[PDB]
Design a protein around this ligand. Structure first.
Ligand SMILES: Cc1cc2nc3c(=O)[nH]c(=O)nc-3n(C[C@H](O)[C@H](O)[C@H](O)COP(=O)(O)OP(=O)(O)OC[C@H]3O[C@@H](n4cnc5c(N)ncnc54)[C@H](O)[C@@H]3O)c2cc1C
Ligand SMILES: CSc1ccc2c(c1)N(CC[C@@H]1CCCCN1C)c1ccccc1S2
Ligand SMILES: CSc1ccc2c(c1)N(CC[C@@H]1CCCCN1C)c1ccccc1S2
Ligand SMILES: Nc1nc2c(c(=O)[nH]1)N[C@H]1C(S)=C(S)[C@@H](COP(=O)(O)O)O[C@H]1N2
Ligand SMILES: Nc1nc2c(c(=O)[nH]1)N[C@H]1C(S)=C(S)[C@@H](COP(=O)(O)O)O[C@H]1N2
Ligand SMILES: c1ccc2cnncc2c1
Ligand code: MOS
Ligand code: MOS
Ligand code: FES
Ligand code: FES
Lengths: 1290, 99, 50, 50
């Protein structure tokens, strides 16, 4: 019956008979046509859907602004609220807001897909803190992920708001005017001013939603519908219904009930209301710890600590305290701390008040200790600590911030009296079972004992007995979890045996000098410097080549006006396509049952391989009789809406029959015929006879998800004449989309056109699978004579799409005692997934050499078919894998030689003039110069001894340092692959329209082409415009990949402009002072054509793989990278302190864009080598929930200090304006972090007496780090027999 | 091309021109329409000369394409257009032309 | 370079789809831009003749 | 199946433009009153030369 009234961007919104299942993110985009708020992941993780919620409190008479993720907000909970969106704060047609201006002009957008989310986080903080500190801004951005920029640009923009040659003019930014901000809509203030008691009701066929606005009403609805969930923030229930198949027919969702918002400062503690957000609790507790004595604020410190790392700011401002406590997540960070602190819950029912303790039995949901079905949590009591009462909280995860815990803990002690006899003890752990667990029996046995090391040894063992983990346990990481449990117990000992020394120094002993670093955690600050050339006096001041010109679409990224593929409006009567994918790794499809699915609401069609017949293949789209991996396409469900399609897809019943063998690993794939790729240089077998030492070793390397922020997206629109299709798709290869769609429809290419304006990141993962999906989508569209849209959710996308190839490298190395590798016999193995990969092996081998001359070399490679998602090409294209393995070989030799890796790197380096394994002459002057400048700027030698100084002084924390050189050759297989084309029109007003085969993915290609046009035609960039990329305008264009897009399309764009000048030479000479409008007009008047095709034939390139020699590369991008880290030997955490990068780029066409490519590549590499990890079960299922969640780098992961230098220009008359195409280059430089961690672990291994075989694999995770730092805790843990259990992973 | 189909059958005549000049069936040629995004600065479709003048421009483009493909066509006289186009791409010869 | 005009076919013209067509398109595009919306203008036969 | 301009599908949220035309051959426009017209259902805007 009730109406849903709220505001969005100042404008009233009324929905009558509203569906209560409607979420805000869909509503904004589809119903309000506000497409700036984006879909990234759909679980609150990435912050792409960040918005501002505003509410008036009629009691306190103040407007409260908080951030939130729109993907989890149900619109029925917005009654009387004011949503603000990226569009709301400014636009190009109104006026640009400063946050929008600065994030763009600081070059903080590349692909731009994360920009609106960043803007709304920044904007929201500024509305609460107009004069902020940088900490407050970076804390707000804790939940905001970016895959392109590396964060530094966004942090520079944040600094401009903080009181305290460049890429951007900070002084030119208009100042923030807090008095001229958006007024909170006055009507909502009037609505709140009358405290209506009317309980609101919304409904549909599926759901009934009750919003009680009083406590009396709330309890009345809790009696009626006892099993209905009380929705507050929807950050627990929301993700469960979204992808754990849960459904609630009745929802109770109360408004701000004053009893649930209580903040009572009691005599013996405080009572916090169940409706308070976690962010509000953090403020309340941060306030009291600053104004009460430390003796009483012990519990509030522990909660503060874990609230600092709990998700990001968006989830904290949504999630409620009561919701946290009641939802009882096993990996809850707060509940273990609450468990140990004698906290009690204030319950309330219709039939009265009640109070129960928050104990292990409550956390394990024992009915007699739980809430009754008819009652609610009103508030929680958290008492003040007494004298000699101490509490600590610990946690470890994949990264420091915005990531679920692997293990966490709360631990309390009580001594009383003052002596050292322990009188109470509660020790709770999370992430080690289905619920939070208290070691009640261990603690009972420890009562009466003293606080000494003899307690620890026994306390560790009976804890290890009590908190048992089966080797098959959910989450995996069993051996690591075991260690963390006792390693936190060790840290707790040290914290307590220190506050005791502080308070009572004569009785208790001082800590061991080397041990003290265990207590301080690894915090952060973000410093950076950017060196580059700035030509110059010779050049015309309006020539834009060399200048740091902002990305053309950058401000539109900031305002949300940039249209990405799904942002295209609803086409009349369009349908939606979604796929049923395989749930088995290698099985026979015995049957499919579409009966229930076909009958369901909105369903137009469901296609199997049968229904595609002879057009189910290219150069198979849907599975036929067998499946060969999880995530393979099986059915295509077509419906009138997205929800209807997803619903019907879940009721498609497929039954399988598993098949042997189930091949998952590379070793398993090695047991018909694979083609070999080989490089022979010198004579390896004779070299092995004349070397001081021989060394065998290997390293495995994990894959990598692309994690483009824009998921796979397309709109396929049939014209309704001559079977014409228009295909709008986020892809890197329009020509391939054209071909596969045309082929599928059995049409000539002239009927199918593919159009691409922009792609929200790609990195290689928007090519082959994109076309398969576009082919299937276009089949449906043609079949039903309707436009069809296919956009994948993040889970589907990661499963359906591939990743980077996992590698295995095997090497046998002969070397001298000074560290010269005179013989090397290399083997590469790529994990291909279900299909072939060999392109990647080839580039692996050709770029394997990197910075080093290997005078006798035998490099061999083989792609390996497994039953996992079919992996694709990735930014780096074999080099990140092939380079790491040679550095691994170098590091193992260094160890045997007693020399540092950097001495072995410099002794094996290519000389100024030298030759590659494939007989190409190279000028490695800039390789050497990059290495030297990187040693100098980083002050390597001085920091080297500072790290050795630290390591000799610290036992439980170590630092490490590494430097790595870069040679990234650029060049495709052949001349035809590197050809490119453009089309340039000059209109009679003098304005220019240009286009070309290249695709904007965030790399700023289109910006560079306008810079090229500006130079060549001698006109401002404002006078040139580009719409996008199309097969209708420029045919037969090659893939946008290989670090050469701007490089090659730039030459074609140049070619077109020069053709136009040749024609206009007569016109220009007769009127030198004339404008372009005059020249264009007088050209038309004299019948001179003002349209021209541009063309570049391509770089000459060849490779004879029989002989193993050729000229495949046009030029070489050189560099070096130094990185420093500190590790936590107890937990396995690490911090990246500093990273210095020097890079030969030739003459940069745009140093803002080119520096942005280095940072992005570097951070994408850093992730690959450290924190990015895909977990697969023994049955080939990808794990995607809990601590198994996949984590790209965040702001917390970004190096604290970052220096980037570009080497002065080098003159290369074979490329566009002597520039070098980077983009892929910097990825490998992130292994500097890998080897810095490798060094740090070696320091702990040397001190402790652990010599010999140190092979750490990539990704170098906290699991791998901590288990490498062996000690009494690693040797102590329980261990299972290898084959006695089935593991969760590997 | 810059010309507009008003019912006078201009587009039909341009495909007839393309069919003669490239020596291919009319079924192998397609036209979608007219656009300032593809062909700039086009004069009015009037004066009894639309097909007349746009036909000469369409002819001009086809001949430009043959000049480039003359090497390709002589080495393989029996070949199809698919073969000639493919081998043109393989040898970095442009297959787009203004008329 | 910001404005593109696309024409697939015309259902007869004979000279009468030039100057007034552009006037109407100019006015129509002013509205579309003003309100940030697609705008369609199709005349009835009486209006058209007048 | 031949698509003419008005045969193009409804674009999402598109508006419609129609003209008020002159009913006199040579006269002065002493005034225009858009008051009733502006208040009526669906009306987004009415433009004069102003
Ligand atoms: C992206 C993301 C990251 C996260 N990261 C972390 C992390 O790092 N660490 C961590 O510890 N947690 C994390 N969480 C979990 C989060 O803290 C909880 O989901 C949240 O605290 C639950 O609060 P809520 O208000 O959303 O509960 P809701 O989803 O609204 O409700 C959950 C349950 O509690 C019940 N309930 C709620 N209020 C009451 C009441 N007053 N009386 C009775 N029953 C009630 C409901 O009936 C329901 O069954 C994360 C969640 C997300 C989505
Ligand atoms: C590669 S040097 C270069 C690069 C960009 C521009 C430029 C020169 N000129 C020359 C002025 C020309 C002379 C020829 C016809 C058009 N008029 C404007 C400008 C001068 C002043 C403002 C903007 C520009 S744009
Ligand atoms: C102006 S003479 C003219 C006009 C139209 C066609 C034509 C000749 N040819 C030549 C065959 C060419 C030879 C060159 C390459 C392509 N093959 C088909 C045809 C023969 C048979 C069927 C259709 C056609 S299309
Ligand atoms: N922001 C952004 N940068 C990116 C990519 C991307 O998808 N987004 N892709 C990379 C890849 S894999 C390649 S091959 C190059 C291609 O463009 P370029 O040749 O102009 O550098 O861009 C790189 N940089
Ligand atoms: N069916 C049809 N035929 C038509 C017209 C038309 O609108 N429809 N316009 C005429 C006019 S006024 C001119 S100028 C010519 C232009 O086309 P052409 O030069 O190709 O004949 O077509 C003539 N024939
Ligand atoms: C198909 C898929 C990926 C590719 C990456 N780089 N070059 C060519 C490719 C062809
Ligand atoms: O060539 Mo980039 O898409 S791996
Ligand atoms: O030239 Mo025809 O439109 S009178
Ligand atoms: S946070 Fe909602 S889209 Fe990723
Ligand atoms: S620009 Fe931030 S995700 Fe691409």
């Amino acid at each position: 019956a009730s109406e849903l009234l709220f505001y969005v961007n100042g404008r009233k919104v009324i929905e009558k008979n509203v569906d209560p299942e409607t979420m805000l993110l869909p509503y904004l985009r589809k119903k309000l046509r506000l497409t700036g708020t984006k879909y990234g992941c759909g679980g609150g993780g990435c912050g792409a859907c960040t918005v501002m919620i505003s509410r008036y409190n009629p009691i306190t008479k103040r407007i409260r602004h908080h951030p939130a993720n729109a993907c989890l907000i149900p619109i029925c909970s917005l009654y009387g609220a004011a949503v603000t969106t990226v569009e709301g704060i400014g636009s190009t047609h109104t006026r640009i807001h400063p946050v929008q201006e600065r994030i763009a002009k600081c070059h903080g957008t590349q692909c731009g897909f994360c920009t609106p989310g960043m803007v709304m986080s920044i904007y929201t903080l500024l509305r609460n803190h107009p004069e902020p500190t940088l900490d407050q801004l970076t804390d707000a951005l804790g939940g905001n992920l970016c895959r392109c920029t590396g964060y530094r640009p966004i942090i520079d923009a944040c600094k401009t708001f903080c009181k305290t040659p460049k890429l951007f003019a900070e002084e030119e930014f208009l100042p923030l005017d807090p008095t001229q901000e958006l007024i909170f809509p006055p009507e909502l203030m009037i609505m709140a001013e009358k405290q209506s008691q009317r309980t609101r009701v919304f409904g549909s066929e599926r759901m009934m939603w009750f919003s009680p606005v009083t406590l009396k009403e709330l309890l009345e609805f809790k009696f009626k519908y006892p099993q209905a969930p009380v929705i507050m923030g929807n950050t627990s229930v929301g993700p469960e219904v979204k992808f754990k198949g849960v459904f609630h027919p009745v929802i109770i969702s109360p408004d701000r009930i004053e009893e649930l918002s209580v903040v009572n400062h009691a005599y013996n503690g405080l009572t916090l209301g169940a409706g308070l957000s976690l962010a509000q609790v953090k403020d309340i507790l941060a306030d009291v710890v600053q104004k009460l004595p430390e003796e009483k604020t012990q519990m509030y410190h522990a909660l503060l600590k874990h609230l600092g790392t709990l998700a990001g700011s968006q989830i904290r401002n949504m999630a409620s305290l009561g919701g946290h406590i009641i939802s009882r997540h096993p990996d809850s960070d707060l509940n273990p701390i609450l468990a140990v602190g004698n906290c009690t819950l204030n319950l309330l029912s219709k039939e009265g008040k009640r109070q129960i303790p928050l104990n292990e039995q409550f956390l394990s949901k024992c009915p007699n200790a739980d809430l009754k079905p008819q009652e609610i949590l009103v508030s929680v009591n958290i008492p003040y600590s007494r004298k000699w009462e101490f509490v600590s909280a610990f946690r470890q995860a994949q990264r420091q911030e915005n990531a679920l815990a692997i293990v966490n803990s709360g631990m309390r002690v009580f001594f009383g009296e003052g002596d050292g006899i322990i009188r109470e003890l509660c020790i709770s752990y999370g992430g080690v079972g289905p619920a939070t667990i208290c070691a009640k029996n261990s603690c009972q046995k420890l009562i009466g004992r003293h606080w000494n090391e003899q307690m620890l040894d026994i306390a560790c063992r009976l804890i290890l007995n009590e908190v048992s983990l089966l080797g098959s346990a959910p989450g995996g990481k069993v051996e690591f979890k075991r260690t963390l449990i006792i390693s936190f117990l060790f840290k707790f000992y040290l914290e307590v045996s220190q506050i005791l020394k502080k308070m009572d120094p004569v009785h208790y002993p001082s800590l061991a000098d080397k041990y003290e670093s265990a207590l301080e955690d690894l915090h952060s600050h973000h410093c950076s410097t950017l060196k580059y050339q700035n030509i110059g006096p010779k050049q015309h001041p309006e020539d834009p080549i060399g200048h740091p010109i902002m990305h053309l679409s950058g401000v539109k990224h900031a305002t949300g006006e940039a249209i990405y593929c799904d942002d295209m409006p609803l086409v009349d009567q369009e349908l939606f396509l979604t796929f049923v994918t395989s749930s088995r790794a290698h099985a026979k499809i015995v049957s499919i049952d579409l009966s229930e699915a076909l009958s369901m609401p909105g369903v137009v069609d469901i296609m199997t391989a049968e229904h595609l017949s002879d057009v189910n293949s290219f150069c198979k789209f849907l599975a036929t009789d067998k499946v060969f991996c999880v995530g393979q396409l099986v059915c295509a469900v077509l419906a009138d809406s997205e929800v209807q399609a997803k619903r019907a897809a879940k009721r498609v019943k497929i039954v399988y029959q598993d098949l042997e063998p189930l091949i998952l690993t590379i070793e398993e794939s090695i047991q018909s015929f694979k083609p070999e790729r080989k490089l022979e240089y010198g004579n390896v077998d004779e070299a092995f006879k004349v070397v001081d030492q021989i060394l065998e070793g290997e390293i495995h390397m994990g894959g990598q998800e692309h994690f483009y922020m824009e998921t796979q997206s397309m709109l396929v629109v049939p014209k309704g004449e001559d079977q014409e299709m228009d295909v709008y798709v986020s892809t890197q290869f329009p020509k391939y989309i054209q071909d596969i769609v045309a082929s599928t429809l059995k049409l000539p290419a002239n009927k199918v056109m593919c159009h691409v304006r922009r792609v929200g990141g790609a990195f290689g993962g928007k090519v082959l699978k994109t076309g398969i999906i576009a082919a299937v989508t276009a089949f449906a569209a043609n079949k039903h004579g309707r436009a069809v849209r296919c956009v994948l959710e993040r889970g589907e996308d990661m499963l359906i799409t591939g990743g980077r190839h996992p590698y295995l490298g095997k090497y046998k190395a002969g070397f001298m005692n000074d560290g010269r590798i005179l013989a090397l016999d290399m083997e590469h193995y790529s994990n291909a997934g279900a299909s072939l990969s060999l392109f990647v092996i080839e580039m692996g081998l050709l770029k394997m050499d990197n910075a080093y001359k290997f005078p006798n070399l035998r490099c061999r490679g083989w792609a390996c078919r497994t039953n996992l998602p079919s992996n694709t090409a990735f930014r780096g294209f074999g080099f990140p894998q092939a380079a790491l393995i040679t550095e691994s070989c170098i590091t193992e030799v260094a160890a045997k030689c007693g020399l540092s890796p950097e001495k072995v790197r410099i002794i094996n380096m290519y000389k100024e003039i030298d030759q590659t394994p494939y007989k190409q002459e190279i000028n490695a002057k800039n390789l050497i110069q990059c290495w030297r400048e990187c040693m100098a700027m980083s002050s390597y030698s001085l920091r080297k001894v500072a790290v050795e100084k630290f390591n000799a002084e610290n036992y439980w924390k170590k630092k490490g340092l590494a430097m790595v050189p870069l040679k990234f050759p650029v060049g495709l297989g052949s001349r035809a692959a590197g050809q490119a084309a453009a089309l340039v029109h000059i209109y009679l007003d003098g304005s220019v329209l240009v286009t070309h085969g290249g695709i904007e993915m965030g790399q700023g290609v289109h910006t560079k082409m306008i810079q090229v046009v500006s130079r060549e035609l001698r006109m401002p960039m404002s006078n040139v415009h580009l719409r996008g990329t199309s097969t209708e305008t420029v045919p037969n264009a090659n893939i946008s990949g290989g670090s050469v897009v701007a490089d090659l399309n730039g030459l074609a764009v140049k070619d077109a402009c020069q053709t136009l000048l040749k024609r206009l030479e007569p016109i220009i000479s007769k009127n030198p002072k004339g404008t372009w409008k005059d020249w264009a007009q007088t050209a038309f008047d004299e019948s001179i054509n003002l349209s021209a095709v541009g063309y570049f034939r391509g770089y000459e390139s060849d490779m004879n793989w029989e002989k193993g020699e050729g000229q495949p590369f046009e030029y070489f991008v050189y560099g070096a990278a130094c990185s420093e880290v500190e590790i936590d030997c107890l937990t396995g955490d690490h911090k990246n302190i500093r990273t210095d990068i020097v890079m030969d780029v030739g003459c940069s066409i745009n140093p803002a864009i080119d520096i942005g490519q280095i940072e992005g590549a570097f951070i994408q590499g850093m992730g690959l080598y450290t924190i990015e990890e895909l977990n697969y079960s023994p049955q080939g299922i990808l794990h995607t929930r809990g601590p198994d969640q996949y984590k790209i780098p965040a702001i917390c992961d970004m190096p604290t200090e970052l220096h980037i230098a570009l080497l002065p220009p080098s003159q290369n008359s074979n490329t566009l304006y002597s520039s070098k195409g980077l983009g892929e280059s910097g990825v490998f430089l992130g292994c500097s972090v890998f080897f810095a961690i490798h060094d740090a672990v070696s320091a702990a291994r040397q001190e402790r007496g652990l010599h010999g075989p140190l092979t750490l694999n990539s990704p170098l995770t906290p699991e791998k780090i901590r288990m490498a730092c062996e000690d009494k805790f690693t040797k102590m843990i329980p261990r299972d027999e290898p084959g006695s259990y089935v593991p969760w992973n590997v």
